[PDB]
Amino acid sequence: VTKKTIYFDLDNPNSDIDAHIEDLRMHMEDEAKTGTVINGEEIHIVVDRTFF
Amino acid sequence: VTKKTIYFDLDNPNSDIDAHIEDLRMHMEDEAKTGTVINGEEIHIVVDRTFF
Amino acid sequence: IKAKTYPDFKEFVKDFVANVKAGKRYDFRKYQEAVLPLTYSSPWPESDIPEVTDFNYTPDYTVPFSEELLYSVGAQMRTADFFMDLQYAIINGKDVDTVYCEWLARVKPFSMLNAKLKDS
Secondary structure (H helix, E strand, O other): OOOOOOOOOOOOOOOOHHHHHHHHHHHHHHOOOOOOOOOOOOOOOOOOOOOO | OOOOOOOOOOOOOOOOHHHHHHHHHHHHHHOOOOOOOOOOOOOOOOOOOOOO | OOOOOEOOHHHHHHHHHHHHHOOOEOOOOOOHHHOOOOOOOOOEOOOOOOOEOOOOOOOOOOOOOOOOOOOOOOOOEEHHHHHHHHHHHHHHOOEEEEEEOOOOOOOOOEEOOEEEEEOO
16 A cells, blocks of 8 residues: 655645545545445644644 | 854844743753753843833 | 845835835735834844745736825734735836835834835
8 A cells, every 4th residue: 555645735825724624534434445335534634843 | 161142133033932932941941951941931121112 | 135235114114115126026925924013123134034936926906006195194914915916016017116114113013114116
């Protein structure tokens, strides 16, 4: 499997953060492939100081 | 030890004060070296007239 | 236009028109809330306003209301629309004398901005 990296592009003022969060949820939903319902919002997002 | 000085750069409108306050918090939380958990919110900031 | 370079709106729009006269065009009607600081006395702009190279704006109404007014006195329009209509006037040959912002109170979605226009 290829690692999923999401570029938030927080430097520019016209980066749709909602789209990136939706990408994160959709990737956590589709790629699970466990055969059950997946709640993509039930995740830990651990970030460093610069990203925060 | 070495004294810590934090330059708020209040004259520059683009300086982000939240980062500086967070630096003030994390310096007291990291350099305490007391071996116990540390709350950096209690820091007793005393400020000169012009700085205020 | 770098972020928070101008300490107020009056000095912000002074070099916004000058940039437009130099051939620079701007478009921020889709991300309007991310570039306009609240209150006209705050440093302008809140975030850097990028340039555009495909500025093709044809409004549905006559942008120069009179020969010396961008809108009728008291007309309210979207703030991002004001800059586009102002840019339309400089492109067509109208010069800006004073931008009316003395007693205005709102910058976000709708604002009562006006400009006094001149020939050449």
